[PDB]
Structure 1
Amino acid sequence: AGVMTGAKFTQIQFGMTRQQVLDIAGAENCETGGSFGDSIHCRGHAAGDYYAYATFGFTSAAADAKVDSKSQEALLAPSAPTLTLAKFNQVTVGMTRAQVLATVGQGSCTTWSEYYPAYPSTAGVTLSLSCFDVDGYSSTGAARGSAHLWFTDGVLQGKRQWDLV
């Protein structure tokens, strides 16, 4: 079914089994154990010295464990990247995701990581967004004008940017 893709990443849902993840992502693209412990790491197309990828964390090592974490780099593309250094500097810790998006642009970000440490409960959910400027996103290369915004329970805890103008 090809390598790992953004569409596959999106189709995979929290609560899914290891087998459901593998069948959707394509077993050939995935690995587990070693550096990735109990998680399932799926590679997409080559990019730089590695690849676009997705990592799925599970509640336990059991074969019936459920997906409680979804992470990806270069699989999802921002719909309308308009982030700038000026907008980034206006983002403030304490903002809700809505407030952050109103500041950096509704289509400037993609979900880098989403984790539920208390799954099935959504309390304590941590979420990292990868946001890019007009030309920041690159699927095969490296981000050029981007930022990382992380939240806990929907509230921004911190921010960091690289090469925004």
Structure 2
Amino acid sequence: GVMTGAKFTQIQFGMTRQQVLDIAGAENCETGGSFGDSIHCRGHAAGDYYAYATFGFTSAAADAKVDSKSQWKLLAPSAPTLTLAKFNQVTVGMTRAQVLATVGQGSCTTWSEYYPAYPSTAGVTLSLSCFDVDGYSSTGFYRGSAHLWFTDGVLQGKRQWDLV
């Protein structure tokens, strides 16, 4: 099959390029072009492209390790409960734990997650996509969602579209 959320979850930070391809299925994946030395794996048709993952590595070397995981429409929120009111309760400067308790522990999926000093977590950057009860779709247009981004575990900004 194509790239999936289960495959994305099975792939871990620190795995090699070939470990990524073992799990993802190299028939789904590419490198080069617009993706540089990252590995980009397509899932099902969605929107004007495909659900996908992009994996970044510590270097171009054949045995470099995953230091970056990004995905679009591979993961559904486990219990979306975000509202406009909860979004307005989030404040720049909050820690990740404070944000998740505010928006709901099941409301978000990880959009991008990057460790520039991998295996160290210093400088980690994180983008969460968070959804109201029916805002997520694995194929079509979001119906109520937010982008929350962090550096070193501290919320640096927030944006939302169509929350109520």
What is the TM-score of this pair, normalised by structure 2?
0.98
CA distance in 1, matches of 2:126, 2:83: 21
C-alpha offsets along residues 62-106 of structure 1, whole Å, 9 cap, x if unaligned?
101111000001101101101111110110011111110111111
Shift of 1:30: 0.4
Residue 98 of structure 1 corresponds to 97
Following TM superposition, the consecutive aligned residue runs of length 4 or more in structure 1 with deviations greater than 4 angstroms are: none
Paired residue secondary structure (2:99): helix
**Cα displacement string for residues 13-49 of structure 1 (whole angstroms, at most 9, x for unaligned residues):** 1111110001100001101100000100001110010
Tell me which residue corresponds to 1:116.
Answer: 115
Identity of aligned residues (%): 98
- Aligned partners of 1:120, 1:11: CA distance in 2, in Å? 18
Task: Report how many residues are paired.
Answer: 164
Structure 1 residue 157, shift from structure 2 partner:
0.7
CA distance in 1, matches of 2:72, 2:95: 23
- How far 1:144 moved relative to its partner? 1.2
- Tell me the TM-score normalised to structure 1 length: 0.98
Alpha-carbon distance, 1:121 to partner: 1.2
CA distance in 1, matches of 2:16, 2:104: 34
Q: Secondary structure at the match of 1:9?
A: helix
Gaps in structure 1 of 5+ consecutive residues = none
- Long gaps (5+) in structure 2: none
C-alpha RMSD of matched pairs (Å): 0.7
